[PDB]
Coordinates of C-alpha atoms in Angstrom, one line a residue:
Chain O
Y1 CA 0.0 0.0 0.0
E2 CA 1.3 3.4 -1.0
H3 CA 1.0 6.8 0.8
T4 CA 2.2 10.4 0.7
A5 CA 3.0 13.0 3.3
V6 CA 5.0 16.2 4.1
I7 CA 7.4 16.7 7.0
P8 CA 8.8 20.0 8.4
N9 CA 12.6 20.6 8.0
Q10 CA 13.7 21.5 11.5
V11 CA 16.1 19.4 13.6
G12 CA 14.7 17.5 16.6
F13 CA 11.0 17.6 16.0
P14 CA 8.3 14.9 16.0
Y15 CA 5.8 14.4 13.2
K16 CA 3.5 11.5 12.6
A17 CA 1.1 10.1 10.0
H18 CA -1.2 7.2 9.2
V19 CA -2.3 4.5 7.0
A20 CA -5.9 3.3 7.4
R21 CA -6.0 0.4 5.0
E22 CA -9.3 -1.4 5.3
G23 CA -10.3 -4.3 7.6
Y24 CA -6.9 -4.3 9.5
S25 CA -6.0 -2.2 12.5
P26 CA -4.6 1.3 11.9
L27 CA -0.9 2.0 11.8
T28 CA 1.0 5.2 12.8
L29 CA 4.4 6.1 11.5
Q30 CA 6.7 8.8 12.9
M31 CA 9.4 10.7 10.9
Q32 CA 12.1 12.8 12.5
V33 CA 15.1 14.4 10.9
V34 CA 18.5 14.6 12.6
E35 CA 20.9 16.2 10.0
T36 CA 20.6 18.3 6.9
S37 CA 23.6 19.2 4.7
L38 CA 23.7 21.4 1.7
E39 CA 26.3 21.5 -1.1
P40 CA 26.9 23.8 -4.1
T41 CA 29.1 23.2 -7.2
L42 CA 32.3 25.0 -7.8
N43 CA 34.9 25.7 -10.5
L44 CA 38.2 27.4 -9.8
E45 CA 39.1 30.7 -11.5
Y46 CA 42.4 31.8 -10.0
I47 CA 44.4 32.0 -6.7
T48 CA 46.6 34.5 -5.0
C49 CA 49.5 34.4 -2.5
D50 CA 52.3 36.5 -1.1
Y51 CA 55.3 37.4 -3.3
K52 CA 59.0 38.2 -2.9
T53 CA 61.5 40.2 -4.9
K54 CA 65.0 39.4 -6.1
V55 CA 68.0 41.7 -6.8
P56 CA 70.8 39.6 -8.2
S57 CA 74.2 41.3 -7.7
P58 CA 74.6 44.4 -9.8
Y59 CA 77.3 44.7 -12.5
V60 CA 80.3 47.1 -12.7
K61 CA 82.9 47.3 -15.4
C62 CA 84.9 50.4 -15.7
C63 CA 86.2 52.5 -18.6
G64 CA 83.8 50.6 -20.8
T65 CA 80.2 51.5 -20.9
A66 CA 77.4 48.8 -21.0
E67 CA 74.6 47.0 -22.6
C68 CA 72.0 44.8 -20.9
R69 CA 69.8 42.3 -22.6
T70 CA 66.2 41.5 -22.2
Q71 CA 64.8 38.1 -21.1
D72 CA 61.5 36.4 -20.5
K73 CA 60.3 36.6 -16.8
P74 CA 57.4 38.6 -15.4
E75 CA 58.2 42.3 -14.6
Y76 CA 61.8 42.5 -15.7
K77 CA 63.3 46.0 -15.7
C78 CA 66.9 46.9 -16.5
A79 CA 68.6 50.3 -16.2
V80 CA 71.8 52.0 -17.0
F81 CA 73.5 54.8 -15.1
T82 CA 76.4 57.0 -16.1
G83 CA 79.1 58.8 -14.0
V84 CA 79.3 56.5 -11.0
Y85 CA 82.4 56.3 -8.8
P86 CA 82.1 53.7 -6.1
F87 CA 84.4 53.3 -3.1
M88 CA 84.5 49.8 -1.7
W89 CA 86.0 48.4 1.5
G90 CA 89.7 48.1 0.8
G91 CA 90.2 51.4 -1.2
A92 CA 88.9 53.0 -4.3
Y93 CA 87.7 50.3 -6.7
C94 CA 88.8 51.4 -10.2
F95 CA 90.1 54.6 -11.6
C96 CA 88.6 55.3 -15.0
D97 CA 86.9 58.1 -13.2
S98 CA 84.7 60.1 -15.6
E99 CA 83.5 57.4 -18.0
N100 CA 82.0 54.7 -15.8
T101 CA 78.6 53.1 -16.3
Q102 CA 76.6 50.6 -14.2
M103 CA 73.5 48.5 -14.7
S104 CA 70.7 47.1 -12.5
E105 CA 67.9 44.6 -12.7
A106 CA 65.4 43.0 -10.4
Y107 CA 62.2 40.9 -10.6
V108 CA 59.3 39.5 -8.7
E109 CA 58.3 35.9 -7.9
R110 CA 56.1 33.9 -5.6
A111 CA 57.3 33.2 -2.1
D112 CA 58.2 29.9 -0.4
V113 CA 55.0 29.5 1.7
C114 CA 52.4 29.6 -1.1
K115 CA 52.0 25.8 -1.1
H116 CA 50.7 25.9 2.5
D117 CA 49.1 29.4 2.5
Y118 CA 46.9 30.8 -0.3
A119 CA 43.5 32.4 -0.8
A120 CA 41.5 31.2 -3.8
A121 CA 38.4 32.4 -5.7
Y122 CA 35.5 30.3 -7.0
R123 CA 32.0 30.5 -8.5
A124 CA 28.7 29.0 -7.5
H125 CA 25.7 27.4 -9.3
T126 CA 22.6 25.4 -8.5
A127 CA 23.0 23.1 -5.4
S128 CA 21.6 19.8 -4.0
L129 CA 21.0 18.8 -0.4
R130 CA 20.9 15.5 1.5
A131 CA 19.2 14.5 4.8
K132 CA 19.4 11.9 7.5
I133 CA 16.0 10.7 8.8
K134 CA 15.1 8.5 11.7
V135 CA 11.8 6.7 11.0
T136 CA 10.0 4.4 13.5
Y137 CA 6.9 2.3 13.7
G138 CA 5.8 -1.2 14.4
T139 CA 8.6 -3.0 16.2
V140 CA 11.6 -1.2 14.6
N141 CA 14.0 1.7 15.2
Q142 CA 15.8 2.7 12.0
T143 CA 17.7 5.6 10.5
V144 CA 18.5 6.3 6.8
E145 CA 20.5 8.8 4.8
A146 CA 18.9 10.0 1.6
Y147 CA 19.3 12.4 -1.3
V148 CA 16.5 14.8 -1.8
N149 CA 16.3 15.3 -5.5
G150 CA 13.4 13.0 -6.4
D151 CA 15.2 9.9 -7.8
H152 CA 16.9 8.0 -4.9
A153 CA 15.1 5.1 -3.3
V154 CA 16.2 3.2 -0.2
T155 CA 15.3 -0.2 1.2
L156 CA 14.1 -0.9 4.7
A157 CA 12.7 -4.4 5.5
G158 CA 10.6 -4.6 2.4
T159 CA 9.6 -1.0 2.0
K160 CA 10.5 1.9 -0.4
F161 CA 11.0 5.5 0.5
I162 CA 11.4 8.2 -2.2
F163 CA 11.4 11.9 -1.2
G164 CA 9.9 14.9 -2.9
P165 CA 12.3 17.2 -4.8
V166 CA 12.3 20.5 -2.8
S167 CA 10.1 23.3 -1.6
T168 CA 12.5 25.8 -3.2
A169 CA 16.3 25.7 -3.8
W170 CA 17.6 29.1 -2.8
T171 CA 21.0 29.2 -1.1
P172 CA 22.9 31.5 1.3
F173 CA 25.5 32.2 -1.4
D174 CA 25.6 34.4 -4.4
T175 CA 27.6 33.8 -7.6
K176 CA 31.1 34.8 -6.4
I177 CA 32.7 33.5 -3.2
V178 CA 36.3 33.5 -1.9
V179 CA 37.6 30.9 0.5
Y180 CA 40.6 31.2 2.9
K181 CA 41.2 28.6 5.6
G182 CA 38.0 27.6 7.2
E183 CA 35.6 30.5 6.5
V184 CA 34.0 31.8 3.4
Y185 CA 33.6 35.4 2.4
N186 CA 31.4 37.3 0.0
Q187 CA 33.5 39.6 -2.3
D188 CA 33.4 40.9 -5.8
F189 CA 36.9 40.2 -7.2
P190 CA 38.5 41.7 -10.3
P191 CA 38.2 39.6 -13.5
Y192 CA 41.7 38.7 -14.7
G193 CA 44.8 40.7 -15.4
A194 CA 43.2 44.0 -14.3
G195 CA 44.3 44.2 -10.7
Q196 CA 45.4 47.7 -9.9
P197 CA 48.2 47.8 -7.3
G198 CA 47.6 47.6 -3.6
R199 CA 44.2 46.0 -3.1
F200 CA 43.1 42.3 -3.4
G201 CA 44.1 40.3 -6.4
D202 CA 47.5 41.8 -7.1
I203 CA 49.2 38.5 -8.1
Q204 CA 47.2 36.0 -10.0
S205 CA 47.7 32.4 -11.2
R206 CA 45.5 29.5 -12.3
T207 CA 46.1 25.9 -10.9
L208 CA 48.8 26.3 -8.5
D209 CA 51.9 24.6 -10.0
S210 CA 53.9 27.1 -12.0
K211 CA 55.0 28.9 -15.2
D212 CA 52.5 31.8 -15.5
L213 CA 52.0 34.9 -13.5
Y214 CA 50.6 38.4 -13.6
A215 CA 52.3 41.2 -11.7
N216 CA 51.9 45.0 -11.9
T217 CA 53.3 46.6 -8.7
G218 CA 55.0 49.6 -10.3
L219 CA 58.8 48.8 -10.1
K220 CA 61.0 51.8 -10.8
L221 CA 64.8 52.0 -10.5
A222 CA 66.5 54.9 -8.8
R223 CA 69.9 56.5 -8.8
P224 CA 72.5 55.0 -6.3
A225 CA 74.1 57.1 -3.6
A226 CA 77.2 59.2 -4.0
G227 CA 80.0 56.8 -3.2
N228 CA 78.5 53.5 -2.2
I229 CA 77.6 50.2 -3.9
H230 CA 74.0 49.3 -3.2
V231 CA 70.9 48.9 -5.3
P232 CA 68.0 51.3 -4.6
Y233 CA 64.5 50.0 -5.0
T234 CA 61.0 51.5 -4.8
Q235 CA 57.6 49.8 -4.7
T236 CA 54.0 50.1 -3.4
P237 CA 53.8 47.6 -0.6
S238 CA 52.2 44.2 -1.0
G239 CA 48.5 43.6 -1.4
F240 CA 47.9 40.3 0.2
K241 CA 49.3 41.0 3.7
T242 CA 47.5 44.3 3.8
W243 CA 44.2 42.5 3.4
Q244 CA 44.4 40.0 6.2
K245 CA 44.5 42.5 9.0
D246 CA 41.9 45.1 7.9
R247 CA 39.4 42.7 6.5
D248 CA 35.6 42.6 7.2
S249 CA 33.4 40.5 9.4
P250 CA 33.2 36.9 8.1
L251 CA 30.2 35.0 6.8
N252 CA 30.0 32.8 9.9
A253 CA 28.4 35.7 11.7
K254 CA 25.8 37.0 9.3
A255 CA 24.4 33.7 8.0
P256 CA 20.6 33.9 7.7
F257 CA 19.0 30.9 9.4
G258 CA 21.6 29.5 11.8
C259 CA 23.2 28.0 8.8
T260 CA 26.6 26.9 10.0
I261 CA 29.7 26.4 7.9
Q262 CA 32.8 24.2 7.9
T263 CA 34.8 23.6 4.8
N264 CA 37.3 21.3 3.4
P265 CA 34.4 20.7 1.1
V266 CA 32.1 23.7 1.4
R267 CA 28.8 23.0 3.2
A268 CA 26.0 24.6 5.1
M269 CA 24.5 22.5 7.8
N270 CA 21.2 22.3 9.9
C271 CA 19.7 25.0 7.8
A272 CA 16.1 25.3 8.9
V273 CA 13.6 26.5 6.3
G274 CA 10.6 24.9 4.7
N275 CA 9.0 21.5 4.1
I276 CA 10.2 18.3 2.5
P277 CA 7.7 15.9 0.9
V278 CA 7.9 12.1 1.3
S279 CA 6.2 9.2 -0.4
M280 CA 5.7 5.7 0.8
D281 CA 5.6 2.1 -0.5
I282 CA 4.7 0.0 2.6
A283 CA 5.2 -3.8 2.8
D284 CA 2.5 -6.2 4.2
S285 CA 4.2 -8.1 7.1
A286 CA 4.1 -5.0 9.4
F287 CA 0.4 -4.9 10.1
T288 CA -2.0 -6.8 12.4
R289 CA -5.1 -8.3 10.9
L290 CA -7.9 -8.7 13.4
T291 CA -7.0 -11.7 15.5
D292 CA -4.9 -9.8 18.1
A293 CA -6.9 -6.6 17.5
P294 CA -8.8 -5.7 20.7
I295 CA -12.3 -4.3 20.6
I296 CA -12.7 -1.0 22.5
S297 CA -16.0 0.9 22.9
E298 CA -17.6 3.8 25.0
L299 CA -14.5 6.0 25.1
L300 CA -14.6 9.0 27.3
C301 CA -11.8 11.6 27.7
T302 CA -11.4 14.3 30.4
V303 CA -8.6 16.7 31.3
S304 CA -6.9 17.8 34.5
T305 CA -4.0 20.2 33.9
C306 CA -2.5 22.4 31.2
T307 CA 0.0 25.1 30.4
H308 CA 1.0 26.4 27.0
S309 CA 4.2 26.2 27.4
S310 CA 7.1 24.7 25.5
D311 CA 7.1 21.0 26.3
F312 CA 4.7 18.2 27.3
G313 CA 2.5 20.1 29.7
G314 CA -0.9 18.8 29.1
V315 CA -2.2 15.6 30.6
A316 CA -5.3 13.6 30.0
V317 CA -6.8 10.2 31.2
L318 CA -8.9 7.8 29.2
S319 CA -11.7 5.5 30.1
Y320 CA -12.8 2.4 28.1
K321 CA -14.3 -1.1 28.5
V322 CA -12.0 -3.8 27.3
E323 CA -12.6 -7.4 26.1
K324 CA -9.0 -8.6 25.3
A325 CA -5.5 -7.5 26.1
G326 CA -3.0 -6.3 23.5
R327 CA -1.7 -2.9 22.2
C328 CA -3.6 -0.2 20.4
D329 CA -2.5 3.0 18.6
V330 CA -3.3 6.6 19.3
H331 CA -3.6 9.9 17.4
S332 CA -5.2 13.3 17.5
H333 CA -6.7 14.3 14.1
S334 CA -6.1 18.1 14.3
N335 CA -3.2 20.5 13.9
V336 CA -3.6 22.3 17.3
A337 CA -2.0 19.7 19.6
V338 CA 0.4 16.8 19.0
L339 CA 0.6 13.8 21.2
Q340 CA 3.7 12.2 22.7
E341 CA 3.6 8.4 22.9
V342 CA 3.1 6.1 19.9
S343 CA 1.3 3.2 21.4
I344 CA -1.0 3.0 24.5
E345 CA -1.1 -0.1 26.6
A346 CA -4.1 -2.4 27.1
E347 CA -6.8 -2.8 29.8
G348 CA -7.7 -0.1 32.3
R349 CA -7.2 3.6 32.4
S350 CA -4.2 5.2 30.7
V351 CA -2.9 8.7 30.3
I352 CA -1.5 10.7 27.4
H353 CA 0.6 13.8 27.2
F354 CA 0.2 16.6 24.7
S355 CA 1.2 20.2 24.0
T356 CA -0.8 23.2 22.6
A357 CA -0.1 26.8 22.2
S358 CA -3.6 28.2 22.5
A359 CA -6.0 29.4 25.2
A360 CA -8.8 26.8 24.8
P361 CA -8.3 23.7 22.5
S362 CA -10.7 21.2 21.3
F363 CA -9.8 18.2 19.1
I364 CA -10.8 14.6 18.5
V365 CA -8.6 11.6 19.6
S366 CA -8.9 7.9 18.8
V367 CA -7.3 5.0 20.5
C368 CA -8.4 2.4 18.1
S369 CA -11.1 2.6 15.4
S370 CA -13.6 4.3 17.8
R371 CA -13.4 8.1 18.1
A372 CA -13.9 10.6 21.0
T373 CA -13.4 14.2 22.0
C374 CA -12.2 16.2 25.0
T375 CA -11.6 19.9 25.5
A376 CA -10.0 22.2 28.2
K377 CA -9.2 25.7 29.3
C378 CA -5.6 26.8 29.9
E379 CA -3.4 29.5 31.5
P380 CA 0.1 30.9 30.9
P381 CA 3.4 30.0 32.6
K382 CA 5.6 32.2 34.7
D383 CA 8.9 32.2 32.8
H384 CA 10.5 34.2 30.0
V385 CA 13.6 32.3 28.7
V386 CA 13.9 28.6 27.9
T387 CA 16.9 26.6 26.7
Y388 CA 15.1 24.2 24.3
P389 CA 12.6 25.0 21.6
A390 CA 9.4 24.6 19.9
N391 CA 7.4 21.4 20.6
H392 CA 4.2 22.6 18.9
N393 CA 3.1 23.9 15.5
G394 CA 2.8 27.5 16.7
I395 CA -0.8 28.2 16.0
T396 CA -2.5 30.3 18.6
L397 CA -6.1 30.8 17.3
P398 CA -9.4 30.9 19.1
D399 CA -11.9 28.1 19.1
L400 CA -15.5 27.9 18.0
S401 CA -16.8 27.7 21.6
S402 CA -14.7 29.3 24.4
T403 CA -15.3 31.4 27.4
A404 CA -13.7 34.2 25.4
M405 CA -16.0 34.4 22.5
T406 CA -19.2 33.0 24.0
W407 CA -19.2 36.7 24.9
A408 CA -19.0 37.4 21.2
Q409 CA -22.2 35.9 20.0
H410 CA -24.2 37.6 22.8
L411 CA -23.0 41.1 21.7
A412 CA -23.3 40.4 18.0
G413 CA -26.6 38.7 18.4
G414 CA -27.6 41.5 20.8
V415 CA -26.7 44.2 18.3
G416 CA -28.2 42.0 15.6
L417 CA -31.5 41.9 17.6
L418 CA -32.3 45.6 18.2
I419 CA -32.3 46.4 14.6
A420 CA -34.8 43.7 14.1
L421 CA -37.5 45.4 16.0
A422 CA -36.5 48.6 14.2
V423 CA -36.9 47.1 10.7
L424 CA -40.5 45.9 10.9
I425 CA -41.9 48.7 12.9
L426 CA -40.9 50.8 10.0
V427 CA -42.8 48.6 7.7
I428 CA -46.0 48.1 9.7
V429 CA -47.1 51.7 9.1
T430 CA -45.5 51.8 5.6
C431 CA -48.4 49.8 4.3
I432 CA -51.1 51.9 6.0
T433 CA -49.9 55.1 4.6
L434 CA -51.2 54.1 1.2
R435 CA -54.7 54.4 2.4
Chain J
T1 CA 49.0 22.4 18.5
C2 CA 49.2 25.2 21.0
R3 CA 47.4 26.1 24.2
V4 CA 44.8 28.9 24.8
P5 CA 43.8 30.7 28.1
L6 CA 39.9 30.1 28.2
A7 CA 38.5 33.3 29.8
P8 CA 36.1 32.7 32.8
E9 CA 32.3 32.0 33.0
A10 CA 29.5 34.4 32.0
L11 CA 26.4 34.1 34.0
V12 CA 23.0 35.1 32.5
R13 CA 20.0 36.9 33.9
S14 CA 16.5 37.1 32.4
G15 CA 13.8 39.8 31.9
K16 CA 10.6 39.9 30.0
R17 CA 11.3 39.8 26.3
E18 CA 15.1 40.4 26.8
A19 CA 18.0 38.6 28.4
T20 CA 20.8 40.6 29.9
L21 CA 24.4 39.6 30.7
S22 CA 27.2 40.3 33.2
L23 CA 30.9 39.8 32.4
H24 CA 34.1 39.6 34.4
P25 CA 37.2 39.6 32.2
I26 CA 40.8 39.1 33.2
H27 CA 42.3 40.3 30.0
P28 CA 40.5 41.2 26.8
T29 CA 37.8 39.0 25.2
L30 CA 35.1 39.2 22.5
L31 CA 31.3 39.0 22.1
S32 CA 29.0 38.4 19.2
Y33 CA 25.3 37.4 18.7
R34 CA 23.1 36.4 15.9
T35 CA 19.4 36.3 15.4
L36 CA 17.7 33.3 13.8
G37 CA 15.1 35.1 11.7
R38 CA 15.5 36.1 8.1
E39 CA 17.6 39.3 8.6
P40 CA 20.1 39.3 11.4
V41 CA 21.4 42.2 13.5
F42 CA 25.0 40.8 14.1
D43 CA 26.5 43.5 16.3
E44 CA 29.9 42.6 18.0
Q45 CA 32.5 44.5 19.9
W46 CA 35.7 44.1 22.1
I47 CA 35.5 44.6 25.9
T48 CA 38.4 45.1 28.4
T49 CA 36.8 46.1 31.8
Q50 CA 33.8 44.6 33.6
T51 CA 30.5 46.0 32.4
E52 CA 27.2 44.6 31.3
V53 CA 25.5 44.5 27.8
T54 CA 22.0 43.5 26.8
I55 CA 20.8 41.5 23.8
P56 CA 17.3 41.4 22.3
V57 CA 15.6 38.0 22.0
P58 CA 12.6 37.3 19.8
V59 CA 10.3 34.3 19.7
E60 CA 12.6 32.7 17.0
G61 CA 15.8 32.5 18.9
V62 CA 19.3 34.1 19.4
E63 CA 22.8 32.8 20.3
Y64 CA 26.0 34.4 21.6
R65 CA 29.6 33.2 22.0
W66 CA 31.9 34.4 24.8
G67 CA 35.6 33.7 24.4
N68 CA 36.9 30.3 23.5
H69 CA 33.7 28.4 24.2
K70 CA 31.3 26.4 22.1
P71 CA 28.2 28.5 21.6
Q72 CA 24.9 28.6 23.5
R73 CA 21.5 28.9 21.9
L74 CA 18.7 30.7 23.7
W75 CA 15.0 31.1 22.7
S76 CA 12.1 32.9 24.4
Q77 CA 8.9 31.5 25.8
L78 CA 5.3 32.6 25.2
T79 CA 4.2 34.6 28.2
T80 CA 1.6 37.2 28.8
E81 CA 0.8 39.4 31.8
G82 CA -3.0 39.2 32.4
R83 CA -5.5 36.3 33.0
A84 CA -7.5 34.3 30.4
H85 CA -11.0 34.3 31.7
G86 CA -13.4 36.9 33.2
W87 CA -14.4 40.4 32.5
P88 CA -13.9 41.5 28.9
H89 CA -11.8 44.5 29.8
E90 CA -9.2 42.0 30.7
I91 CA -9.4 39.7 27.7
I92 CA -8.6 42.2 25.1
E93 CA -5.4 43.3 26.7
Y94 CA -4.4 39.7 27.3
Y95 CA -3.9 39.5 23.5
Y96 CA -2.1 42.9 23.5
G97 CA 0.9 41.3 25.0
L98 CA 0.9 38.8 22.2
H99 CA 0.1 40.3 18.8
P100 CA 0.1 44.0 19.6
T101 CA -0.4 45.1 16.0
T102 CA -3.6 43.4 15.0
Chain G
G1 CA 26.1 37.6 48.1
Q2 CA 26.0 36.5 44.5
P3 CA 29.6 35.9 43.2
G4 CA 31.9 38.6 41.9
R5 CA 30.7 41.8 43.4
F6 CA 31.1 43.2 47.0
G7 CA 30.3 41.1 50.0
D8 CA 31.4 37.8 48.6
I9 CA 33.0 36.5 51.9
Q10 CA 31.2 37.4 55.1
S11 CA 32.0 37.1 58.8
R12 CA 30.9 38.7 62.0
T13 CA 33.4 39.8 64.7
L14 CA 36.7 39.1 63.3
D15 CA 38.2 36.2 65.2
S16 CA 37.1 32.8 63.6
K17 CA 35.0 29.7 63.2
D18 CA 32.2 30.9 60.8
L19 CA 32.2 31.8 57.1
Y20 CA 30.0 32.1 54.1
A21 CA 31.4 31.4 50.7
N22 CA 29.7 30.8 47.3
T23 CA 32.2 31.3 44.5
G24 CA 31.2 28.4 42.3
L25 CA 33.9 25.7 42.7
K26 CA 33.8 22.9 40.1
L27 CA 36.3 20.2 39.6
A28 CA 37.6 19.3 36.1
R29 CA 39.1 16.3 34.4
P30 CA 43.0 16.1 34.6
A31 CA 45.1 16.0 31.5
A32 CA 46.1 12.9 29.5
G33 CA 49.2 11.7 31.2
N34 CA 50.1 14.1 33.9
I35 CA 49.5 14.5 37.7
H36 CA 48.1 17.9 38.4
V37 CA 44.8 19.1 39.9
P38 CA 42.6 21.3 37.6
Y39 CA 40.6 24.1 39.1
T40 CA 38.1 26.6 38.0
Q41 CA 36.7 29.7 39.7
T42 CA 35.1 33.1 39.1
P43 CA 37.9 35.5 40.3
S44 CA 37.8 37.2 43.7
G45 CA 35.4 40.0 44.6
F46 CA 37.3 42.1 47.1
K47 CA 40.3 42.9 44.9
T48 CA 38.1 43.7 41.9

């Protein structure tokens, strides 16, 4: 026999549904989710890391001028300076005093710590999500992991579960994210090869091995001092290690629905929005036919205590005449109060717990195939802050017959009444004035 | 691995619709707090000397994180101020603590 | 006297034998492979 239902996506919450086949005793299932991942798809676009310069050992030859040659490496700049007269440690270096010339070169490369430390960019797309559900009934506790796009079945002892696709598939990401060591950000990074100096994305590369760079930090070469040997050097300072101290607040603090992150693969867990549908193919060796089905009649329910509040703070007893021992099943057929236990015991009186966030509930309950009702009046608790949430639907609406709005029909009927003598005493002379 | 000081305990106090804090730092620490609705409020700021700060807390839930501790979630419970039966002057304001718009 | 603020340790006339003290002592689990005694406490109330 096959069935369909919907369950709310919120961790640690009971929900329950039926089958009522024909002939046989009823059967009540409960469904409860324990985990909910989420996963987008990525494709890399570039990386960045810190860099380092090199100034390899400038060249002097005296009374003979120069010429330097070009060569392939990113951001190579050579220069040529006339009229230099150094003065090294031992004495004066060489004496062809007027006509001396000197060259200089330097370049930029990646540092030695890039293969442990980098900050990469990415791009997002449509995403899929998977859940873990604990389902119990009959004589069996089981749990099951499942994809949520509507194609993946799974086998319990004879039964098939396939899940509805989604309510809606929005995500707490937009199209461009950037990931650096255990938290994800939300930037808008420059495209490629257009990083102006100083800010983020100053050194690019695709997949992190080698051979290709991009570097525009504005190298210029300056004139050396009067009577020394060094190489001067001028540069706007680096762009990576000026980002990781004056940064932002991360995305682990402005996530919308409690949606927590941890990422060697990027995820978003326990994210609590919406409904997930479920459908059911149920086997046949998990019912009871009629032989051990007890017959129960003249059911009468009362109440003794209630609060609102946030847990199982409503108690009720039951009265019934038995004929045979066994085990029946219980349910309340309305959305205003959910019960606690999944199977009452046999002969005598027995109690049931329930919770309801309303002033005056009324519903109909049925331990086995006979039905009954019982209603109550309620009062608020004296507290303000709890540590554990939400064990009711959250519907606080008035009933059709309460102390509160039994006042309502008297006033509306009362105001409905006094026009009624007014309407006809108009008319009773309205005929006679056509004499 | 490496070892971390673990700043002392923060004890909490309640009030109707908002929970307040009290702190006692030895040497500087951090706070933060989210709100579990659709648009958060996410204020956070460094403290050095002992003061007290207040959070709001709606009927959907908030959570804070003080120092090097795993976080603590914190909801709010449905409470009123009046009765629930009697003279109709009272019943109308009983709802006013609950849905004060409508 | 709730812990932390003034009046955290009381006594009448200053000789001995009677105290009052609620600073929230708890005992913790010792480390993996050492010998010490761990110890946790909200800091004192007079010298704050």
